[model samples]
Every structure is written in C-alpha cells, then in structure tokens.
Target: MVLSEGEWQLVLHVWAKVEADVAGHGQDILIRLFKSHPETLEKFDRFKHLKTEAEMKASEDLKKHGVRVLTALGAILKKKGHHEAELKPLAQDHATKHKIPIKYLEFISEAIIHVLHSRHPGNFGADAQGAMNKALELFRKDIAAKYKELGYQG
Candidate 1:
C-alpha cells in the first residue's frame, strides 16, 4: 500500500511519540501499555514481574536500538520522495514476532505522543510535526522491507 505525504506525516508524528515515551518513561509506559493490552503479554513474556529494577534495566538495549532505528527513519524522511511501502515488512515482522498487530504499534505511538505533548507543552517545536512525517515515512519503508524478507507478500 502506498502512503500519501499526509499519511507519512501522521506516521512521523507517531514515531516521535514512541521515541519520547521509550526515552522518557520506558518502564512505566511499557508496563501500562501491557496492562491495558494484556494480550501483548503473550508476545513479550518479559513483562511479567516487570516492576523490578532488573526488568527496567534490561530495556536499555532495546531503547538504544529504538534510537538507532528512529535516527535512520529521520534520515530517510529527509530525502523525501521515498517509498513508504518499504516499511511494511519491518512492521509486519515486529508485529508478528510480538504477537501484536500493526494497529497496536500505532496505538502505542499515538499514546506516547499524546502523553508527551500533554506533559511537556511548548517543548516540541512548530516543526515537530514535520519531523514526525519524515520519521514515519522511513519507518514504513524499513518495515515493508522486513515483511518482504519474511515472505509475506501482503
């Protein structure tokens, strides 16, 4: 599926939200999101007893990976005229492995963004939305490639 420029902008906004959530409240956000979406527990067993310090610390690596992925996404968006379909594979792989749906990923992304904006008003600049658009475009492209690699034509 092809995403329009406006859709890509929404994706970027969602990506920024995810980044902020994981960076600012990694443990809390994950725990809460899991509690609300219990089915996700099946995909990520580590959520059990997640309140412990060890569990929180274990997320450091994932957080770093998230940062790297987000950076790559930002770069892709900057290039413009990039294809969003390329990201479907990556999103599908992540969703399948996590036993969650793509919508869940989107849900979390939006939730994080809403929380951050509400909590830190004025911290995000006028160009924040534009930045998110770029991030989402790249994300979609990366995930789509991953999905194709997994032999999923859809």
Candidate 2:
C-alpha cells in the first residue's frame, strides 16, 4: 500500500512528536486498549492479572512490552508501511503462541490512533488520523494473512 506524500508527512511528523517518549506513549496505547476492551488483557499472560490502572501504570513489564509494541510501530512507519516481511514472524507468534484475535489488533490500532490524537490534537487532524488508519491497516492485514496461513479462521 502506498501513502500519498502528504499522508506520509502527516504520519511521520506526528510519530516523531510522540517518539520522544516511546515507553510513555506506548503505555498510553496499551492502557487505553485494556480500559476500553478489558478482555484483551487475557491475551497477555504477563498483564492479564493486572486489574487496576495504577497496577498497569507501575508495571515495568507493561512498560517493556509497550516499548516492544511502539518500537514495532516505529519500525513499520519508518519503512513507510511496507512491513509484510518484518511482521510475518510476529504474526506467527501471535497466531499460535499468543492466540491474539484480529479484533484485538483492531483494538490496539484504535488505541494508538486515539492516543496520538489525545496527545497532539493540533497536528493529528483528520489527514493524520487517516494516514495512521491506512498505515495500521497494512499492519492488521499482514498479521491477519499470517493467521490465515496458520489456519486460524478467526
């Protein structure tokens, strides 16, 4: 998938702004995801037991996991949405070991977008949100493809 030059700039610019604090912003994304869809916590063995926002907030494990997640997002964005090869192994793991549903990925996608908007509403307008939506669409697509390859009907 190709992002228009304008879309590319909008995405990269806002990402750069949030990239200053990967752990914090990434945590924000996951926090929002868990708060909005509490069932998604079941997918994470480490965090599934966390029942409170403060517990999640104070978790080094959550922060580290958030770093991994945000780092992956940064890598994908840096590559301009061409992340099929890069995401295949991750998708395999999630498809098998993690047992993540695509719906949870959709939840995270929206969480990321909402976090971006909350953080930088001035810059993260409709164009930037659209760009992010399209960018993460590739992420969801690649992961779903791997799930299909693994014979996951969900």
Candidate 3:
C-alpha cells in the first residue's frame, strides 16, 4: 500500500504516541488499525507466535546500531537526495518475512522516531525532520543488508 504523505504523518504521530506509552494510546491505535485492516490480524498473529523476547531485544539492538548509519545517510541525502520508493520494498519485505503487519511496521518507524525525539528534541527539530527520515531510511538499509547477507535477497 502506497501511503500518502498525510497518512504517513498520522502514522508517525501514532507511533510517537505508542513509544511514549501515551496512556495505552499506542495499543489503542494498533487495535483501531487492525480493526480497520482485518487482514492484518493474520500477520499480527504470526508475529506474536513467532517473535521471542530475545528476538525483539536483538531487533532493538540492531535499530540502535542502524540509527548511526541512518544519520550518515541523512547527511548524504541532504546534499545528494533520495526517494521514498527506494525504501518501500525494504519495509514490505520485512513485513512479509517477519510476519509483521505493514501497519505495525509503519507504527514502529514512527514510534522509534518519537523515542529519539523525546530523548533529544532539539536534535530532531522542525527544520531538519532529519531524525525521522534517517530513522526510517536506516531501518530499510539495515534490513536490506541483513537479508542480503543471510542469502535471502530475491
């Protein structure tokens, strides 16, 4: 599904709210999302069944490392530039392979940015919007790299 800019913005908002645990708002948003997109339930069920605490912890660790790469990529893009299309496949592949709903992937990206902004609001400013873009970009790149390294690139 090709998300519009406005839709993506809403995704980011929900994600940020989720990461902050906003009075259970994250779960609420997810519930609403799943209700609206019923097909996503199957994917969510798969993720719930397959994911272990250790796997989640590892994913978190990878995200931390990938953030640095994202930061660098953001700097390059500031001058050279890139496109959203370049990253969409990465998200799709992760969702398909990991059994994560696409909606969850969208929310997770936003939640991650929200967490980073909460920690250093000044760093992820209005003008830059750098943190959010970098976060998503690095996420895509990291996933792609890992999949390729695992001999799963197809």
Candidate 4:
C-alpha cells in the first residue's frame, strides 16, 4: 500500500494540473458512473433520477455534490493518508446508511483514472496509475476494515 516518492509526485502533479478542472472532472466521474452503471444511482438521494450528462450538469445539487467529492479527495490527497480519521466514519455512513457496497469504490477509482488519463493524455502513465491504485488500495483497506467492524456483508 506504500508508494514511492516519485509515484506520489506523479499523482500530485496530475492533481495539480487538473485542480482547476476538478469540478468538471468530478461531474464527469459521477456522470460516467451513472451512465455506465445505473444501479449506482440508487445510493444517490438527490441525483438518483438524473440520467444524462445534460440533466446532471443542469442539476444544482449534482454540481454541489460533485464539489463535495472533489473536496473530500482534495483533503485526502493533501493529508497523504491522514484523512483516515474522518474518512472511516464517513465511509461507515455511506456503507450503513446509503447501503453502498465496497465494490462501488472501484467504480470511483475507475472514474478517477478516466479523468486522469483523459486530462493528462500522455502524462498519466503506468507509474501514475500504480500510485493511484496503491493509494486507493490502502484507502479501501482502511474503510473495509471499518465496514467489517460494522457487520456489513454488502
């Protein structure tokens, strides 16, 4: 679950480059998830009915929630694994309250990888992917442990 210094730097570089575009990237992630796997919308109370890119883009709550996810990601990446304190409780709520499965977390990573590669093109190479995978693996492990403690089989 540990990444090299270069790997962290690579991830940070991509994040920095896309910071300005994070809103759209966040929206894209949610849109991609909704489009690719419609079932995922079941957990979304506000955006559950939103179906298309235009519909989502037009929803004010969708925009707000996208920014929320971006803010969470920004906090996690900035603290470099230190966000676990808050992340675990937040994940627990999503798991228990929203009935979200751990598997959907991969969908999130998929969206991130899509955004990274799409935005950076030649820049988001193997090493960057590895870094993201490693970081997300660690993150998932942490949250999954919490999930287990809560007795969630989902």
Candidate 5:
C-alpha cells in the first residue's frame, strides 16, 4: 500500500511527542519492545539480564541505546528525500554487519507502532498507523534489496 507524503508527515507528528522527550520517551518505546518480545533482549548485551519490565526500564544503558535509536529515526525523518544515503547506515548495521533477521526487526517495528498508537490515542489513529506501517514496509523493501546483495536473505 502507498502512503501519502502527508500521511508520512502525520507519522512524524506522532513522533513529535517522542521527540519532545527523546530520552524519556525513547526508553519507554524500547521498554515496550523488550516487554512485548523478551527474546529480543538477548541481542543487547546490556539488556540481557533484566527479567522484569521494571528492571528493563531502570537501565541507563537501555536509555542510552533507546535515545540513540530514536535519534537515528529522527535523522531518517529529516532526510526524507535522501533516504538511500540516510537509511543506508541503519540497513547496513542491522542487516549487513549484524546480520539481524528482518523478521525480528519487523516485530520491533510493529511494537513501536503500537506504542505510538497507545501514547497518542487521539492523533495516532488508524490512518497514522497505516501510514507508519507503509513507511516501514517501503523501508524494509529497500533494505532487503540491499541485504540480498550482502547474501543476508533473512
């Protein structure tokens, strides 16, 4: 499905609240991800221990990583027209260097969408979620194509 430019702008609107509190809100998004998919924590050496959601939330390292990741997304948002160059780092790190599976990232992406939907119930309506999903879908497609060149089919 195609997402309009305005719809993508709406996606950014949803992110504005998170941008307002990148350190605080960013941690919350990752907390939700770890809570939603406990196995994902195993990949992060810093987050491998925390058995409970509270434990996960209290980690300073997690906070740093979350903020780092969100800022990367913020950069992507800023480089909308230059997606190939901007997103290359994300696709390279996750898919090429780390060889992280696409499915795992998709799970995290979906969790993020849910977090946005819950956080901004009024503005993050179906339309916003749809647009965000479409945006990620396009992202994955582009990233996947690049990954195939690296022989990382997953």
Candidate 6:
C-alpha cells in the first residue's frame, strides 16, 4: 500500500512515543512475541531458555537484542525510501544465516503493534494502528521478498 502523507505522519506520531522508551518497548515486544508463540523461541538460542516473564525481563542479552531490532525499525522510518541496501543484508542474514521463518516476521509485527498499544493505550487509536500495520507490512514484504530472492524459501 502506498501510504499517504497523513498515514506517514500517523505512524510517526505513535512511533515517537515508542521511541521514548525504545529499549523498554522492545523488551515488551520480544516478551509478547515469545509468550504468544513459544515455538518461535527456537529461533533465538540465546533466549530459548527464558521460560518465565521474570527471567526474560531480567535478561540483559534480551534487552540488547530487542534494542537492535527496535533501532532497525527506527532507522527505516527515519529514512523513508525503497533502499535495497538497508534491508537486503538484514533479510539475507535473518533468512539464510539465522534461518528465521517468514511467518515469524509477521509475528514480530504483531508483537510490535501489541506493545505499542500497551505502551500508549490512548495514543494508538485505530488510525495510528492502521498506519502502523501498513508500515510494518511493507517492511515485512521487503524482507520477505529478499528472502525469496536469496533462495531461503521460508
């Protein structure tokens, strides 16, 4: 979907809120992702053993990884363009090196939206959520396309 200028502003509106506590929100997102789909835990050996919320919350490694993921999103949003270079390496590494399933990207997007809502209950209204949905969908498609191109098939 080609996002209109208003749609772009709407996403960045909510994104700024998330950016304030990016690390915390990232932590929340990963926690939500794992809790919702435990099988995805297999993809992250470092976090596979974090069975309980408490354990996951206290893990610095998880926070570090979460920060990286969150910042990557920020990077893309800050520079709005269809630049293959920024996404290709990420897609290749996640698809071929990490062997992450494409479906997991959707799950991560779900987790991000969920975290966004939880973090700012009133700010993430329907319009903002819808914009975020489209933004993340486009991001996912970019990575998924590269995954297919690289012959990962997942």
Q: Which candidate is the best by lDDT?
A: 2
- Of models 3 and 6, which has the larger lDDT? 6
**Least well predicted 10-residue stretch by lDDT in candidate 6:** 76-85
lDDT of 3 by residue, 63-146 (tens): 453344344333433322244454455445554565453345555555445554554454456533553555455555555555
lDDT, candidate 4, 63-83, per-residue tens = 778888877876777666767
Q: Which runs of model 6 end up more than 4 angstroms from their true locations?
A: none
Model 5 TM-score is: 0.89
Q: Give lDDT: candidate 6, residue 34.
A: 93
| Span of 10 residues, lowest total lDDT, candidate 4 | 77-86
- Sort the candidates on lDDT, descending order: 2, 6, 4, 5, 1, 3
Q: So what's the TM-score on candidate 6?
A: 0.94
Report the lDDT tens digits of candidate 5 across residue range 54-107: 877778888888899888877776554357887667777887566678787787
Q: Positional deviation of 53 in candidate 6, in angstroms? A: 0.5
Tell me the tens digit of each residue's lDDT in model 6 across 59-100: 999999999988888788655545467898888889878998
> How big is the positional error of residue 108 in model 3, measured in Å on the Cα after superposition?
0.8
lDDT of each: 0.51, 0.86, 0.44, 0.78, 0.77, 0.84
lDDT of 2 at 128: 84
Q: Which segments of model 2 are wrong by more than 4 Å?
A: none
Better of 3 and 5 by TM-score: 5
Question: Model 6: how far is 112 from its true place, Å?
Answer: 0.7
User: What's the distance in Å from true for residue 116, model 2?
Assistant: 0.6
Query: lDDT of candidate 3?
Result: 0.44
Q: Considering summed lDDT, which 10 consecutive residues are worst modelled in model 1?
A: 129-138
Q: What is the C-alpha RMSD of each candidate to the true structure, in Å?
A: 6.0, 1.3, 10.6, 1.6, 1.8, 1.2
**Superposed model 1: Cα runs more than 4 Å off:** 1-22, 25-32, 46-89, 123-154
Clash pairs (backbone) in predicted model 3: none
Candidates by TM-score, descending order: 6, 2, 4, 5, 1, 3
Q: Estimate each model's TM-score.
A: 0.47, 0.94, 0.33, 0.90, 0.89, 0.94
Candidate 3, superposed: residue stretches over 4 Å from native: 1-92, 126-154
